[model samples]
Target: SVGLIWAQSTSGVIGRDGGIPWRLPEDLAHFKRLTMGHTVVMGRRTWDSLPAAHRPLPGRRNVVVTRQTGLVAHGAQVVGSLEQALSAATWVIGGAQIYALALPLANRCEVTEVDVDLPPEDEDALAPVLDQTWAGTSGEWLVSRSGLRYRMHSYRRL
Candidate 1:
Protein backbone atom coordinates (compact mmCIF):
# COMPACT_ATOMS: atom_id res chain seq x y z
CA SER A 1 0.00 0.00 0.00
CA VAL A 2 1.31 3.48 -0.77
CA GLY A 3 1.73 5.70 2.27
CA LEU A 4 -1.22 7.92 3.04
CA ILE A 5 -0.63 11.65 3.46
CA TRP A 6 -3.14 13.80 5.35
CA ALA A 7 -3.10 17.47 4.36
CA GLN A 8 -5.28 20.09 6.01
CA SER A 9 -5.21 23.41 7.80
CA THR A 10 -4.41 23.88 11.50
CA SER A 11 -7.80 25.16 12.46
CA GLY A 12 -9.32 22.14 10.75
CA VAL A 13 -11.26 24.73 8.85
CA ILE A 14 -10.92 23.51 5.28
CA GLY A 15 -13.39 26.24 4.50
CA ARG A 16 -14.39 29.33 6.38
CA ASP A 17 -17.36 31.43 5.33
CA GLY A 18 -17.85 28.87 2.56
CA GLY A 19 -14.28 29.30 1.28
CA ILE A 20 -10.73 28.33 2.16
CA PRO A 21 -9.40 29.73 5.42
CA TRP A 22 -5.82 30.56 4.50
CA ARG A 23 -5.39 32.35 1.21
CA LEU A 24 -1.61 32.36 1.38
CA PRO A 25 -0.69 31.57 -2.20
CA GLU A 26 2.22 29.44 -1.11
CA ASP A 27 0.16 27.09 1.03
CA LEU A 28 -2.01 26.04 -1.89
CA ALA A 29 1.07 25.92 -4.07
CA HIS A 30 2.67 23.52 -1.64
CA PHE A 31 -0.47 21.37 -1.56
CA LYS A 32 -0.49 20.93 -5.31
CA ARG A 33 3.22 20.19 -5.39
CA LEU A 34 2.80 17.30 -2.98
CA THR A 35 -0.44 15.89 -4.38
CA MET A 36 -0.33 16.78 -8.05
CA GLY A 37 0.48 13.45 -9.57
CA HIS A 38 -1.22 11.05 -7.17
CA THR A 39 -4.65 9.54 -6.61
CA VAL A 40 -6.85 11.67 -4.36
CA VAL A 41 -9.73 10.03 -2.52
CA MET A 42 -12.23 12.38 -0.95
CA GLY A 43 -15.81 12.46 0.30
CA ARG A 44 -18.77 13.26 -1.88
CA ARG A 45 -19.18 16.78 -0.57
CA THR A 46 -15.51 17.47 -1.05
CA TRP A 47 -15.76 16.46 -4.66
CA ASP A 48 -18.80 18.64 -5.21
CA SER A 49 -17.01 21.64 -3.77
CA LEU A 50 -14.17 21.53 -6.23
CA PRO A 51 -14.02 24.28 -8.81
CA ALA A 52 -14.21 23.10 -12.40
CA ALA A 53 -10.72 24.54 -12.80
CA HIS A 54 -9.52 22.35 -9.97
CA ARG A 55 -11.62 19.40 -11.04
CA PRO A 56 -9.42 16.48 -12.07
CA LEU A 57 -6.68 18.53 -10.32
CA PRO A 58 -4.62 18.54 -13.51
CA GLY A 59 -2.10 15.73 -13.36
CA ARG A 60 -3.63 13.74 -10.51
CA ARG A 61 -6.28 11.05 -10.67
CA ASN A 62 -9.39 11.92 -8.66
CA VAL A 63 -11.51 9.44 -6.74
CA VAL A 64 -14.50 10.25 -4.57
CA VAL A 65 -15.94 7.90 -1.97
CA THR A 66 -19.67 8.01 -1.74
CA ARG A 67 -22.52 5.84 -0.52
CA GLN A 68 -24.92 7.36 -3.00
CA THR A 69 -25.60 4.95 -5.81
CA GLY A 70 -25.19 6.18 -9.36
CA LEU A 71 -22.81 8.88 -8.21
CA VAL A 72 -20.25 9.65 -10.86
CA ALA A 73 -18.21 12.49 -12.26
CA HIS A 74 -16.94 13.02 -15.77
CA GLY A 75 -13.23 13.14 -14.96
CA ALA A 76 -13.26 11.37 -11.58
CA GLN A 77 -13.48 7.83 -10.32
CA VAL A 78 -16.10 6.91 -7.72
CA VAL A 79 -15.65 4.21 -5.15
CA GLY A 80 -17.82 3.10 -2.26
CA SER A 81 -15.22 2.19 0.33
CA LEU A 82 -11.82 3.28 1.63
CA GLU A 83 -10.28 0.00 0.61
CA GLN A 84 -11.53 0.42 -2.91
CA ALA A 85 -10.30 3.96 -3.11
CA LEU A 86 -6.89 2.95 -1.84
CA SER A 87 -6.48 0.28 -4.45
CA ALA A 88 -4.52 2.40 -6.91
CA ALA A 89 -3.81 5.43 -4.79
CA THR A 90 -0.42 6.59 -3.65
CA TRP A 91 -2.14 9.04 -1.30
CA VAL A 92 -5.56 10.13 -0.05
CA ILE A 93 -7.05 13.49 0.85
CA GLY A 94 -9.91 14.05 3.29
CA GLY A 95 -12.95 15.94 4.42
CA ALA A 96 -13.39 14.44 7.92
CA GLN A 97 -14.26 10.78 8.21
CA ILE A 98 -11.84 9.89 5.44
CA TYR A 99 -8.97 11.35 7.47
CA ALA A 100 -9.98 9.43 10.57
CA LEU A 101 -10.34 6.25 8.59
CA ALA A 102 -6.91 6.62 7.00
CA LEU A 103 -5.01 7.68 10.13
CA PRO A 104 -4.48 4.26 11.67
CA LEU A 105 -4.26 2.52 8.33
CA ALA A 106 -1.46 4.68 6.94
CA ASN A 107 2.12 4.07 7.98
CA ARG A 108 3.64 7.15 6.42
CA CYS A 109 1.79 10.35 7.19
CA GLU A 110 2.49 13.87 5.98
CA VAL A 111 0.43 15.85 8.50
CA THR A 112 0.10 19.60 8.47
CA GLU A 113 -0.16 20.94 12.01
CA VAL A 114 -1.50 24.43 12.21
CA ASP A 115 -0.96 26.29 15.49
CA VAL A 116 -3.47 29.06 15.96
CA ASP A 117 -4.42 27.71 19.36
CA LEU A 118 -8.10 27.01 19.96
CA PRO A 119 -10.39 29.97 19.73
CA PRO A 120 -12.44 30.67 22.86
CA GLU A 121 -15.92 30.29 21.46
CA ASP A 122 -15.53 27.83 18.64
CA GLU A 123 -16.95 24.50 19.74
CA ASP A 124 -17.59 22.81 16.41
CA ALA A 125 -13.93 22.36 15.59
CA LEU A 126 -12.69 18.81 15.41
CA ALA A 127 -9.76 17.84 17.64
CA PRO A 128 -6.84 16.03 16.06
CA VAL A 129 -5.45 12.99 17.81
CA LEU A 130 -1.78 13.90 17.71
CA ASP A 131 -0.31 10.69 18.99
CA GLN A 132 3.05 11.06 20.75
CA THR A 133 4.52 8.34 18.57
CA TRP A 134 4.41 10.64 15.54
CA ALA A 135 6.42 13.34 17.31
CA GLY A 136 9.11 10.84 18.24
CA THR A 137 9.36 9.59 14.67
CA SER A 138 11.64 11.26 12.14
CA GLY A 139 9.88 14.04 10.24
CA GLU A 140 10.37 17.56 8.87
CA TRP A 141 8.73 20.96 9.32
CA LEU A 142 8.31 21.81 5.67
CA VAL A 143 6.51 25.17 5.80
CA SER A 144 4.86 27.86 7.91
CA ARG A 145 2.51 30.72 7.15
CA SER A 146 0.98 33.75 8.91
CA GLY A 147 0.53 33.63 12.70
CA LEU A 148 -1.06 30.27 12.02
CA ARG A 149 2.01 28.05 11.79
CA TYR A 150 1.88 24.84 9.75
CA ARG A 151 4.31 21.97 9.41
CA MET A 152 4.26 19.13 6.93
CA HIS A 153 5.29 16.39 9.35
CA SER A 154 5.94 12.92 8.01
CA TYR A 155 6.17 9.63 9.96
CA ARG A 156 6.19 5.93 9.31
CA ARG A 157 3.99 3.89 11.61
CA LEU A 158 5.82 1.65 14.07
Candidate 2:
Protein backbone atom coordinates (compact mmCIF):
# COMPACT_ATOMS: atom_id res chain seq x y z
CA SER A 1 0.00 0.00 0.00
CA VAL A 2 2.75 2.42 -0.89
CA GLY A 3 1.81 5.75 -2.47
CA LEU A 4 4.29 7.79 -4.49
CA ILE A 5 3.53 11.45 -5.18
CA TRP A 6 5.44 14.04 -7.21
CA ALA A 7 4.81 17.24 -9.15
CA GLN A 8 6.94 18.00 -12.15
CA SER A 9 6.82 20.71 -14.77
CA THR A 10 6.87 20.10 -18.53
CA SER A 11 10.51 21.15 -18.47
CA GLY A 12 11.15 18.29 -16.07
CA VAL A 13 12.15 20.77 -13.39
CA ILE A 14 10.49 19.88 -10.15
CA GLY A 15 11.92 22.81 -8.28
CA ARG A 16 14.00 25.91 -9.00
CA ASP A 17 15.63 28.34 -6.55
CA GLY A 18 14.28 26.36 -3.62
CA GLY A 19 10.68 26.46 -4.80
CA ILE A 20 8.54 24.67 -7.32
CA PRO A 21 9.19 25.80 -10.88
CA TRP A 22 5.59 26.59 -11.50
CA ARG A 23 3.46 28.67 -9.18
CA LEU A 24 0.44 26.72 -8.10
CA PRO A 25 -0.59 28.08 -4.75
CA GLU A 26 -3.84 26.14 -4.86
CA ASP A 27 -2.19 22.91 -5.86
CA LEU A 28 0.39 23.35 -3.13
CA ALA A 29 -2.36 24.00 -0.67
CA HIS A 30 -4.17 20.86 -1.72
CA PHE A 31 -0.98 18.83 -1.42
CA LYS A 32 -0.21 20.12 2.05
CA ARG A 33 -3.75 19.43 3.21
CA LEU A 34 -3.94 15.94 1.76
CA THR A 35 -0.54 14.84 3.01
CA MET A 36 -0.85 16.48 6.41
CA GLY A 37 -1.58 13.45 8.56
CA HIS A 38 0.21 10.95 6.34
CA THR A 39 3.73 9.68 6.64
CA VAL A 40 5.88 11.59 4.14
CA VAL A 41 9.04 10.14 2.62
CA MET A 42 11.54 12.00 0.50
CA GLY A 43 15.21 12.08 -0.48
CA ARG A 44 17.97 13.87 1.36
CA ARG A 45 18.06 16.84 -0.98
CA THR A 46 14.37 17.47 -0.69
CA TRP A 47 14.54 17.10 3.04
CA ASP A 48 17.39 19.57 3.21
CA SER A 49 15.57 22.20 1.20
CA LEU A 50 12.55 22.24 3.46
CA PRO A 51 12.44 25.23 5.79
CA ALA A 52 13.11 24.63 9.47
CA ALA A 53 9.51 25.43 10.36
CA HIS A 54 8.24 23.06 7.72
CA ARG A 55 10.85 20.37 8.32
CA PRO A 56 8.71 18.07 10.37
CA LEU A 57 5.27 18.93 9.15
CA PRO A 58 2.95 18.66 12.12
CA GLY A 59 0.64 15.68 12.39
CA ARG A 60 2.73 13.58 10.01
CA ARG A 61 5.69 11.26 10.27
CA ASN A 62 8.73 12.28 8.24
CA VAL A 63 11.31 9.93 6.76
CA VAL A 64 14.32 11.15 4.80
CA VAL A 65 16.26 8.72 2.62
CA THR A 66 19.95 9.29 2.37
CA ARG A 67 23.22 7.45 1.83
CA GLN A 68 25.02 9.49 4.48
CA THR A 69 25.05 7.54 7.68
CA GLY A 70 24.04 9.25 10.93
CA LEU A 71 22.43 12.12 9.07
CA VAL A 72 19.12 12.91 10.68
CA ALA A 73 16.94 16.00 10.47
CA HIS A 74 15.17 17.16 13.56
CA GLY A 75 11.76 15.58 14.00
CA ALA A 76 12.49 13.16 11.15
CA GLN A 77 13.56 9.57 10.97
CA VAL A 78 16.37 8.86 8.54
CA VAL A 79 16.24 5.73 6.40
CA GLY A 80 18.42 4.50 3.58
CA SER A 81 15.83 2.55 1.63
CA LEU A 82 12.31 2.90 0.31
CA GLU A 83 11.20 -0.31 1.94
CA GLN A 84 11.89 1.11 5.36
CA ALA A 85 9.94 4.25 4.60
CA LEU A 86 7.06 2.27 3.16
CA SER A 87 6.88 0.36 6.39
CA ALA A 88 5.64 3.58 8.02
CA ALA A 89 2.68 4.39 5.77
CA THR A 90 1.12 4.14 2.34
CA TRP A 91 1.78 7.75 1.25
CA VAL A 92 5.29 8.94 0.32
CA ILE A 93 6.64 12.03 -1.41
CA GLY A 94 9.57 12.09 -3.86
CA GLY A 95 12.31 13.91 -5.68
CA ALA A 96 14.12 12.38 -8.73
CA GLN A 97 15.88 9.18 -7.75
CA ILE A 98 13.26 8.35 -5.20
CA TYR A 99 10.56 8.49 -7.85
CA ALA A 100 12.52 6.33 -10.27
CA LEU A 101 13.29 3.82 -7.56
CA ALA A 102 9.79 3.74 -6.10
CA LEU A 103 7.96 3.60 -9.42
CA PRO A 104 8.09 -0.15 -9.67
CA LEU A 105 7.57 -0.84 -5.99
CA ALA A 106 4.75 1.61 -5.44
CA ASN A 107 1.17 0.41 -5.31
CA ARG A 108 -0.12 3.80 -6.43
CA CYS A 109 1.25 7.02 -7.96
CA GLU A 110 -0.09 10.56 -7.62
CA VAL A 111 1.53 12.48 -10.42
CA THR A 112 0.97 16.13 -11.25
CA GLU A 113 1.68 16.45 -14.94
CA VAL A 114 2.21 20.03 -16.10
CA ASP A 115 1.57 21.19 -19.64
CA VAL A 116 4.25 23.62 -20.72
CA ASP A 117 7.06 23.74 -23.22
CA LEU A 118 10.50 22.77 -22.08
CA PRO A 119 13.46 25.03 -22.64
CA PRO A 120 15.67 24.01 -25.53
CA GLU A 121 18.58 23.53 -23.17
CA ASP A 122 16.64 21.17 -20.97
CA GLU A 123 16.93 18.22 -23.31
CA ASP A 124 18.86 16.34 -20.64
CA ALA A 125 17.07 17.84 -17.69
CA LEU A 126 15.01 14.75 -17.02
CA ALA A 127 12.91 12.23 -18.85
CA PRO A 128 9.18 11.86 -18.85
CA VAL A 129 7.30 9.16 -16.96
CA LEU A 130 5.69 7.32 -19.80
CA ASP A 131 4.95 3.69 -19.17
CA GLN A 132 1.62 2.94 -20.76
CA THR A 133 1.92 -0.57 -19.44
CA TRP A 134 1.35 0.96 -16.01
CA ALA A 135 -2.38 1.51 -15.94
CA GLY A 136 -3.91 4.59 -14.37
CA THR A 137 -6.88 4.32 -12.06
CA SER A 138 -8.05 7.92 -12.52
CA GLY A 139 -6.90 11.36 -13.65
CA GLU A 140 -8.09 14.90 -13.03
CA TRP A 141 -6.92 18.16 -14.55
CA LEU A 142 -6.34 21.45 -12.77
CA VAL A 143 -5.67 24.77 -14.44
CA SER A 144 -3.42 27.00 -12.43
CA ARG A 145 -3.72 30.76 -12.11
CA SER A 146 -0.91 31.22 -14.59
CA GLY A 147 -2.95 29.65 -17.39
CA LEU A 148 -0.93 26.48 -17.27
CA ARG A 149 -2.71 23.15 -17.51
CA TYR A 150 -1.79 20.42 -15.07
CA ARG A 151 -3.22 16.98 -14.55
CA MET A 152 -3.16 14.83 -11.46
CA HIS A 153 -3.02 11.21 -12.53
CA SER A 154 -3.59 8.35 -10.16
CA TYR A 155 -1.96 5.15 -11.29
CA ARG A 156 -2.33 1.75 -9.72
CA ARG A 157 -0.14 -1.29 -9.96
CA LEU A 158 -1.19 -3.75 -12.66
Candidate 3:
Protein backbone atom coordinates (compact mmCIF):
# COMPACT_ATOMS: atom_id res chain seq x y z
CA SER A 1 0.00 0.00 0.00
CA VAL A 2 2.99 2.24 0.26
CA GLY A 3 5.85 3.18 -2.02
CA LEU A 4 8.41 5.78 -1.11
CA ILE A 5 10.32 7.76 -3.71
CA TRP A 6 13.14 10.23 -3.34
CA ALA A 7 16.60 11.28 -4.49
CA GLN A 8 19.45 11.82 -2.11
CA SER A 9 23.04 12.95 -2.38
CA THR A 10 25.97 10.73 -1.42
CA SER A 11 25.74 12.23 2.03
CA GLY A 12 22.02 11.44 2.27
CA VAL A 13 20.88 15.02 1.99
CA ILE A 14 17.61 15.32 0.08
CA GLY A 15 16.84 19.02 0.47
CA ARG A 16 18.46 22.35 1.07
CA ASP A 17 17.43 25.80 2.35
CA GLY A 18 14.33 26.42 0.22
CA GLY A 19 14.34 24.22 -2.81
CA ILE A 20 16.57 21.56 -4.25
CA PRO A 21 20.07 22.89 -4.71
CA TRP A 22 20.82 20.80 -7.76
CA ARG A 23 19.26 20.40 -11.17
CA LEU A 24 19.27 16.88 -12.53
CA PRO A 25 16.57 16.31 -15.08
CA GLU A 26 17.35 12.64 -15.48
CA ASP A 27 16.47 11.94 -11.87
CA LEU A 28 13.34 14.01 -12.22
CA ALA A 29 12.35 12.01 -15.29
CA HIS A 30 12.68 8.86 -13.21
CA PHE A 31 10.39 10.31 -10.56
CA LYS A 32 7.81 11.28 -13.16
CA ARG A 33 7.85 7.81 -14.68
CA LEU A 34 7.14 6.03 -11.43
CA THR A 35 4.60 8.42 -9.98
CA MET A 36 2.44 8.96 -13.02
CA GLY A 37 -1.07 7.43 -12.95
CA HIS A 38 -0.67 6.72 -9.27
CA THR A 39 -1.52 8.62 -6.12
CA VAL A 40 1.37 10.50 -4.52
CA VAL A 41 1.33 11.72 -0.93
CA MET A 42 3.60 14.50 0.21
CA GLY A 43 4.06 16.72 3.22
CA ARG A 44 2.58 20.23 3.54
CA ARG A 45 5.66 22.22 2.68
CA THR A 46 6.38 19.77 -0.08
CA TRP A 47 3.12 20.75 -1.70
CA ASP A 48 3.95 24.42 -1.42
CA SER A 49 7.30 23.91 -3.10
CA LEU A 50 5.78 22.90 -6.39
CA PRO A 51 5.58 25.48 -9.14
CA ALA A 52 2.49 27.69 -8.90
CA ALA A 53 0.82 26.42 -12.02
CA HIS A 54 1.68 22.76 -11.48
CA ARG A 55 0.60 22.25 -7.90
CA PRO A 56 -1.56 19.25 -8.53
CA LEU A 57 1.14 17.40 -10.49
CA PRO A 58 -0.70 16.51 -13.65
CA GLY A 59 -2.01 13.01 -14.34
CA ARG A 60 -1.68 11.85 -10.76
CA ARG A 61 -3.82 12.15 -7.65
CA ASN A 62 -1.91 14.53 -5.39
CA VAL A 63 -2.42 14.24 -1.62
CA VAL A 64 -0.89 16.46 0.99
CA VAL A 65 -0.35 15.17 4.54
CA THR A 66 -0.43 17.96 7.04
CA ARG A 67 -1.31 18.85 10.60
CA GLN A 68 -1.93 22.45 9.72
CA THR A 69 -5.54 23.27 10.47
CA GLY A 70 -7.68 24.76 7.71
CA LEU A 71 -5.03 24.23 5.06
CA VAL A 72 -6.35 24.08 1.55
CA ALA A 73 -4.56 22.69 -1.47
CA HIS A 74 -5.59 23.69 -4.93
CA GLY A 75 -6.58 20.65 -6.98
CA ALA A 76 -5.03 18.31 -4.45
CA GLN A 77 -6.46 16.34 -1.58
CA VAL A 78 -5.55 17.77 1.77
CA VAL A 79 -5.54 15.26 4.62
CA GLY A 80 -5.17 15.58 8.35
CA SER A 81 -2.50 12.96 8.86
CA LEU A 82 -0.05 10.67 7.10
CA GLU A 83 -2.27 7.66 7.64
CA GLN A 84 -5.04 9.43 5.83
CA ALA A 85 -2.70 10.17 2.96
CA LEU A 86 -1.97 6.45 2.63
CA SER A 87 -5.63 5.56 2.20
CA ALA A 88 -5.45 5.70 -1.59
CA ALA A 89 -1.81 6.35 -2.09
CA THR A 90 1.09 4.20 -3.18
CA TRP A 91 3.85 6.68 -3.72
CA VAL A 92 4.85 8.66 -0.67
CA ILE A 93 6.76 11.49 -2.26
CA GLY A 94 8.50 13.28 0.54
CA GLY A 95 10.11 16.03 2.53
CA ALA A 96 12.08 14.43 5.40
CA GLN A 97 9.37 13.92 7.99
CA ILE A 98 6.99 12.17 5.65
CA TYR A 99 9.69 9.87 4.35
CA ALA A 100 10.83 8.96 7.82
CA LEU A 101 7.33 7.92 8.83
CA ALA A 102 6.49 6.17 5.59
CA LEU A 103 9.62 4.04 5.23
CA PRO A 104 8.67 1.30 7.64
CA LEU A 105 5.41 0.50 5.94
CA ALA A 106 6.58 1.04 2.40
CA ASN A 107 6.55 -2.06 0.25
CA ARG A 108 8.50 -0.42 -2.53
CA CYS A 109 11.04 2.35 -2.91
CA GLU A 110 12.46 4.29 -5.84
CA VAL A 111 15.58 6.22 -5.16
CA THR A 112 17.83 8.23 -7.41
CA GLU A 113 21.23 8.10 -5.83
CA VAL A 114 22.72 11.45 -6.68
CA ASP A 115 26.46 12.12 -6.61
CA VAL A 116 26.71 15.45 -4.89
CA ASP A 117 26.39 16.48 -1.27
CA LEU A 118 24.92 19.66 0.12
CA PRO A 119 27.27 21.48 2.42
CA PRO A 120 26.49 20.41 6.01
CA GLU A 121 25.02 23.77 6.86
CA ASP A 122 22.68 23.63 3.91
CA GLU A 123 21.44 20.08 4.45
CA ASP A 124 17.85 20.69 5.36
CA ALA A 125 16.45 17.23 4.93
CA LEU A 126 17.98 13.76 4.95
CA ALA A 127 16.81 10.49 3.45
CA PRO A 128 15.69 7.71 5.72
CA VAL A 129 17.68 4.48 5.55
CA LEU A 130 16.01 1.41 4.14
CA ASP A 131 15.38 -1.51 6.40
CA GLN A 132 16.60 -5.08 5.85
CA THR A 133 13.15 -6.26 4.85
CA TRP A 134 13.80 -4.56 1.53
CA ALA A 135 15.85 -5.89 -1.36
CA GLY A 136 16.82 -3.85 -4.38
CA THR A 137 18.82 -3.52 -7.55
CA SER A 138 20.90 -0.52 -8.38
CA GLY A 139 21.41 0.50 -11.98
CA GLU A 140 24.60 1.70 -13.59
CA TRP A 141 25.45 5.32 -12.92
CA LEU A 142 24.79 7.85 -15.64
CA VAL A 143 26.13 11.34 -15.99
CA SER A 144 23.44 13.92 -16.46
CA ARG A 145 23.75 16.67 -19.06
CA SER A 146 24.77 18.87 -16.17
CA GLY A 147 27.61 16.43 -15.48
CA LEU A 148 26.08 15.12 -12.26
CA ARG A 149 26.33 11.39 -11.58
CA TYR A 150 23.15 9.58 -10.60
CA ARG A 151 21.53 6.18 -10.79
CA MET A 152 18.18 4.63 -10.00
CA HIS A 153 17.69 2.10 -7.22
CA SER A 154 14.48 0.15 -7.17
CA TYR A 155 13.52 -2.02 -4.22
CA ARG A 156 10.68 -4.20 -3.05
CA ARG A 157 9.64 -5.57 0.27
CA LEU A 158 11.05 -9.00 0.97
Candidate 4:
Protein backbone atom coordinates (compact mmCIF):
# COMPACT_ATOMS: atom_id res chain seq x y z
CA SER A 1 0.00 0.00 0.00
CA VAL A 2 1.50 3.28 -1.15
CA GLY A 3 0.81 6.46 0.84
CA LEU A 4 1.61 10.18 0.48
CA ILE A 5 2.60 12.88 2.95
CA TRP A 6 2.53 16.61 2.28
CA ALA A 7 1.28 19.95 3.59
CA GLN A 8 -0.62 22.40 1.46
CA SER A 9 -1.72 26.00 1.94
CA THR A 10 -5.31 27.16 1.56
CA SER A 11 -4.45 28.36 -1.92
CA GLY A 12 -3.12 24.89 -2.81
CA VAL A 13 0.52 25.88 -2.73
CA ILE A 14 3.14 23.35 -1.75
CA GLY A 15 6.38 24.92 -2.95
CA ARG A 16 7.95 28.21 -3.81
CA ASP A 17 11.30 28.75 -5.46
CA GLY A 18 12.14 25.08 -4.79
CA GLY A 19 11.25 25.05 -1.10
CA ILE A 20 8.20 24.87 1.09
CA PRO A 21 6.80 28.30 1.98
CA TRP A 22 5.73 27.70 5.54
CA ARG A 23 7.29 26.65 8.82
CA LEU A 24 5.14 24.29 10.82
CA PRO A 25 7.29 22.32 13.27
CA GLU A 26 4.43 20.06 14.23
CA ASP A 27 3.80 19.20 10.63
CA LEU A 28 7.46 18.38 10.17
CA ALA A 29 7.30 16.15 13.20
CA HIS A 30 4.23 14.44 11.80
CA PHE A 31 6.13 13.81 8.58
CA LYS A 32 9.05 12.30 10.43
CA ARG A 33 6.89 10.07 12.56
CA LEU A 34 4.98 8.72 9.57
CA THR A 35 7.85 8.28 7.11
CA MET A 36 10.51 6.97 9.43
CA GLY A 37 11.76 3.55 8.32
CA HIS A 38 9.57 3.72 5.21
CA THR A 39 10.56 3.79 1.57
CA VAL A 40 10.00 7.38 0.42
CA VAL A 41 9.67 8.18 -3.29
CA MET A 42 10.02 11.68 -4.73
CA GLY A 43 11.08 13.65 -7.78
CA ARG A 44 14.67 14.63 -8.38
CA ARG A 45 13.85 18.24 -7.67
CA THR A 46 12.29 17.25 -4.37
CA TRP A 47 15.46 15.41 -3.51
CA ASP A 48 17.48 18.50 -4.33
CA SER A 49 15.24 20.73 -2.25
CA LEU A 50 16.18 18.96 0.92
CA PRO A 51 18.80 20.65 3.10
CA ALA A 52 22.28 19.35 2.30
CA ALA A 53 22.50 17.78 5.72
CA HIS A 54 19.11 16.12 5.31
CA ARG A 55 19.30 14.94 1.74
CA PRO A 56 18.30 11.30 1.50
CA LEU A 57 16.39 11.63 4.77
CA PRO A 58 17.94 9.42 7.41
CA GLY A 59 16.24 6.13 8.40
CA ARG A 60 14.22 5.93 5.20
CA ARG A 61 15.02 4.53 1.77
CA ASN A 62 15.06 7.41 -0.68
CA VAL A 63 13.96 6.88 -4.28
CA VAL A 64 14.10 9.79 -6.69
CA VAL A 65 12.39 9.95 -10.08
CA THR A 66 14.12 11.87 -12.81
CA ARG A 67 14.81 11.96 -16.51
CA GLN A 68 18.42 12.98 -16.02
CA THR A 69 20.87 10.22 -16.90
CA GLY A 70 23.83 9.17 -14.83
CA LEU A 71 22.72 11.27 -11.93
CA VAL A 72 24.18 10.17 -8.66
CA ALA A 73 22.18 10.84 -5.51
CA HIS A 74 24.63 10.63 -2.63
CA GLY A 75 22.49 8.55 -0.28
CA ALA A 76 19.56 7.78 -2.55
CA GLN A 77 18.62 5.65 -5.55
CA VAL A 78 17.62 7.40 -8.72
CA VAL A 79 15.03 5.92 -11.08
CA GLY A 80 13.98 7.07 -14.54
CA SER A 81 10.32 6.18 -14.25
CA LEU A 82 7.52 6.61 -11.73
CA GLU A 83 6.65 2.94 -12.02
CA GLN A 84 10.08 1.96 -10.82
CA ALA A 85 9.94 4.23 -7.81
CA LEU A 86 6.36 3.33 -6.90
CA SER A 87 7.17 -0.36 -7.15
CA ALA A 88 9.57 -0.09 -4.24
CA ALA A 89 8.25 2.77 -2.13
CA THR A 90 5.62 2.86 0.59
CA TRP A 91 5.35 6.67 0.73
CA VAL A 92 5.36 9.38 -1.92
CA ILE A 93 6.65 12.72 -0.63
CA GLY A 94 6.59 15.58 -3.02
CA GLY A 95 7.34 18.75 -4.95
CA ALA A 96 3.94 19.00 -6.65
CA GLN A 97 4.41 17.07 -9.89
CA ILE A 98 5.33 13.90 -8.10
CA TYR A 99 2.25 14.21 -5.87
CA ALA A 100 0.01 14.72 -8.90
CA LEU A 101 1.49 11.63 -10.49
CA ALA A 102 1.18 9.47 -7.42
CA LEU A 103 -2.12 10.67 -5.90
CA PRO A 104 -4.33 8.45 -8.01
CA LEU A 105 -2.49 5.39 -6.85
CA ALA A 106 -2.13 6.36 -3.20
CA ASN A 107 -4.01 4.38 -0.56
CA ARG A 108 -3.61 7.01 2.14
CA CYS A 109 -2.73 10.67 2.25
CA GLU A 110 -1.39 12.52 5.26
CA VAL A 111 -2.12 16.14 4.51
CA THR A 112 -1.49 19.25 6.59
CA GLU A 113 -4.34 21.51 5.66
CA VAL A 114 -2.74 24.84 6.35
CA ASP A 115 -5.16 27.64 7.18
CA VAL A 116 -3.28 30.38 5.41
CA ASP A 117 -3.01 31.09 1.73
CA LEU A 118 0.38 31.99 0.37
CA PRO A 119 1.12 35.46 -0.84
CA PRO A 120 1.58 35.89 -4.60
CA GLU A 121 5.34 35.88 -4.42
CA ASP A 122 5.35 32.71 -2.40
CA GLU A 123 3.22 30.65 -4.76
CA ASP A 124 4.85 27.65 -6.30
CA ALA A 125 5.76 27.77 -9.97
CA LEU A 126 3.82 24.56 -10.27
CA ALA A 127 1.28 24.86 -7.48
CA PRO A 128 -0.49 21.68 -6.37
CA VAL A 129 -4.20 21.10 -6.24
CA LEU A 130 -6.20 18.24 -4.73
CA ASP A 131 -8.53 16.89 -7.38
CA GLN A 132 -11.03 14.02 -7.64
CA THR A 133 -8.29 11.66 -6.65
CA TRP A 134 -8.64 13.01 -3.13
CA ALA A 135 -12.38 13.66 -3.17
CA GLY A 136 -14.88 11.68 -1.12
CA THR A 137 -12.13 10.37 1.13
CA SER A 138 -12.60 9.44 4.79
CA GLY A 139 -10.12 9.98 7.61
CA GLU A 140 -9.19 12.01 10.65
CA TRP A 141 -8.37 15.65 11.26
CA LEU A 142 -6.09 17.10 13.89
CA VAL A 143 -5.17 20.55 15.12
CA SER A 144 -1.52 21.35 15.56
CA ARG A 145 0.02 23.17 18.48
CA SER A 146 0.68 26.12 16.24
CA GLY A 147 -3.07 26.47 15.75
CA LEU A 148 -2.87 25.05 12.25
CA ARG A 149 -5.78 22.99 10.95
CA TYR A 150 -5.00 19.78 9.07
CA ARG A 151 -6.08 16.25 8.35
CA MET A 152 -4.75 12.74 7.88
CA HIS A 153 -6.93 10.97 5.37
CA SER A 154 -7.14 7.29 4.43
CA TYR A 155 -8.65 6.00 1.19
CA ARG A 156 -9.40 2.67 -0.37
CA ARG A 157 -9.24 2.22 -4.09
CA LEU A 158 -12.46 0.86 -5.51
| The best candidate in terms of TM-score | 3
- For 16-113, candidate 4 gives per-residue lDDT tens digits of 88888777887888899999998999998899999998987999999999999999999899999878986533988987788888877776776776
| lDDT winner, 2 or 3 | 3
The TM-score values for the models, in the order shown, are: 0.75, 0.81, 0.93, 0.82
- Off-target runs (Cα >4 Å) in candidate 1 are 6-19, 115-128, 135-149
Which parts of model 4 are misplaced by more than 4 Å? 119-158
**Candidate 3 lDDT, 1-158, residue by residue in tens:** 79999988887888887567688999878889888999989998889888787788999999998888878898999898888877544899899999988887888888898888565565488888887788999999999998999999999999
Estimate the Cα RMSD of every predicted model relative to the unseen true structure: 3.5, 2.8, 1.6, 2.9
lDDT of 3 at 129: 85
Candidate 1: clashing pairs of residues: none
Model 4 TM-score relative to the real fold? 0.82
Off by over 4 Å in 2: 17-19, 120-128, 137-141
**TM-score, cand. 1 vs. native:** 0.75
In model 3, which regions exceed 4 Å deviation?
none
* CA-lDDT, candidates in order: 0.63, 0.71, 0.86, 0.78
Candidate 3 local distance difference test against the native? 0.86
Q: Candidate 1: what lDDT?
A: 0.63
